[PDB]
Design a protein around this ligand. Sequence first.
Ligand code: AMP
Ligand code: AMP
Ligand code: ZN
Ligand code: ZN
Lengths: 80, 80, 240, 240
Amino acid sequence: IKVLFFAQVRELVGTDATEVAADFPTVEALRQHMAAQSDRWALALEDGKLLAAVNQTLVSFDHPLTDGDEVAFFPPVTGG
Amino acid sequence: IKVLFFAQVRELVGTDATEVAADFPTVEALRQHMAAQSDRWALALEDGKLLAAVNQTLVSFDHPLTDGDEVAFFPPVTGG
Amino acid sequence: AELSDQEMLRYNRQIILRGFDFDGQEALKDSRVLIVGLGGLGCAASQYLASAGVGNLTLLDFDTVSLSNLQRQTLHSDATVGQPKVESARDALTRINPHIAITPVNALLDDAELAALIAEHDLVLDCTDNVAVRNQLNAGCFAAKVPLVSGAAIRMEGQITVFTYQDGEPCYRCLSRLFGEAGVMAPLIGVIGSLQAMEAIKMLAGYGKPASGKIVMYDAMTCQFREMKLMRNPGCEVCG
Amino acid sequence: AELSDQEMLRYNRQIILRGFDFDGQEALKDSRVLIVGLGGLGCAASQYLASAGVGNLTLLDFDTVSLSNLQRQTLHSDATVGQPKVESARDALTRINPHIAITPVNALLDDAELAALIAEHDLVLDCTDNVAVRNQLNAGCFAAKVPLVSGAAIRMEGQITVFTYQDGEPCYRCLSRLFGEAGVMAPLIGVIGSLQAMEAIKMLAGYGKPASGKIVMYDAMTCQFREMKLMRNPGCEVCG
Ligand SMILES: *O=P([O])([O])O[C][C]1O[C](N2[C]=NC3=C2N=[C]N=C3[N])[C]([O])[C]1[O]
Ligand SMILES: *O=P([O])([O])O[C][C]1O[C](N2[C]=NC3=C2N=[C]N=C3[N])[C]([O])[C]1[O]
Ligand SMILES: [Zn+2]
Ligand SMILES: [Zn+2]
């Protein structure tokens, strides 16, 4: 599973991507997992302050994943 | 062969892409071919007024191609 | 619309673009665009909507110019600190293009007021900085079917979406439902604001293809651009 | 560099960005950037280099402001028609940020002159409209190892590359060797010019990753962005 991290997510967790194993069902399962790795991780992937796309399409924290699934975590932005 | 066309090339030839067959050796062989299809084509893919990338990397009109090769034709731009 | 001779000269570089022509220029001249937020995004976008010849701009913001804004809101200046952003912007905008009509509205509007106001324009640019007003704008735009060109920027991240509110197209809540001071680098606003201006012009003139059904995300830190497709959420409160 | 109190306030939104901070702001304040071409790209880029706090800008252009420029060169105005673009730009730029030093050079320089001038800056923005000067700039930048932030725009197509001139990195001729009035949509210049400002700031402050080794191509017609990798050409006349 290509999970990619963009913008502030990337900057916070220090990696643009981590080829992981396909052991995750969904997106809200992944997020949880990855958030537990560290406070840096938790802040970066903090629920509410995050957006997720599965395979180039944006999804809710319930879409599911599979080997060959690219998952991208990145911040929403409401400033301007 | 995904040959993609961008910006003015696309606008001139009326297609963003044409899945073609892998019957082309290179890039300057393709260009020639495709240019001969019509004046619209010739102008769009006019040598000198064109840039080519093979597989997301920019190449001279001599790089070669193969099935699974994506080729992108698009204009250089020197205005500003 | 008809263009004067002086206008045709001013707008020559657009007029000679292929599928744009006089008609496209005329279309801009006849448009009424509502720009909500004359902060960073608004300044960046309005400047080109103005220069480009969009004939009628309504500028809506409740806030005044502060010194901190001057790092990125380039229509404003030290001399306009304390003035309502819509006024400082209008003055700058009228100098960028004295052929256009500019209507500043220094207020914080309610939904009833936005409904009227949104309906009175051809297109709305959302250049605000908070999801409450963004949702309000989306609600009014959806209701009236007035396209919304939505831009956002913070830090080193920008995003743009065009909502045209067609059948089957997601709305902004489709997006905002997916989520619940910070700095902002100056040029970021330029990129996203100019993209807003571009998509706006494209919509107003029916030129090219709008960035609807996707979020265009610009990661300035790495200079990358990702386009994630946006799907309609079945139970979107607004468009569901 | 040290920032005054008024500067720290003005630049607060950049100063509070994570790896930017006072040091990054100070870095901008201490930079000397040469912007070549105060046309569309130059106006769009300089405005944010200025607002952002790049302390010293040298503006180089030989041309005067014309009415047609006003469709997109928003620093200029009807009142400055006939003036040297560098002067109209300087006047506008000083109002965007009165803390910066701006040096207008209304001339068409030769290679000997560009060599001196390029060497005297930390970074050059190429905002010109012809490959001759672009190659000249690339030549001088390569020689002196002064990073070049190269932008181009015509029609509905824009492009950006950063040349940092490291070992193994392609130069601009690596690109221009691959090839041998037209309109231009106003906001296009905004997008690319702002991207130039962004990459420039990033380089000057060592912030994030520059767009070197690639052409970032923006297709405004479809709002798509493609990044094609640029490789060094073995026999590039300049860097070969
Ligand atoms: O992001 P910036 O802070 O640079 O600009 C946002 C701009 O939007 C304004 N704004 C927020 N909410 C608004 C509004 N304007 C008009 N109505 C509402 N509800 C804010 O004052 C800014 O200048
Ligand atoms: O693309 P625009 O026409 O909007 O702007 C380009 C700008 O570049 C200037 N230019 C071209 N060649 C130059 C130069 N400036 C300085 N030296 C040289 N050799 C042109 O006058 C424009 O304003
Ligand atoms: Zn919806
Ligand atoms: Zn080279």
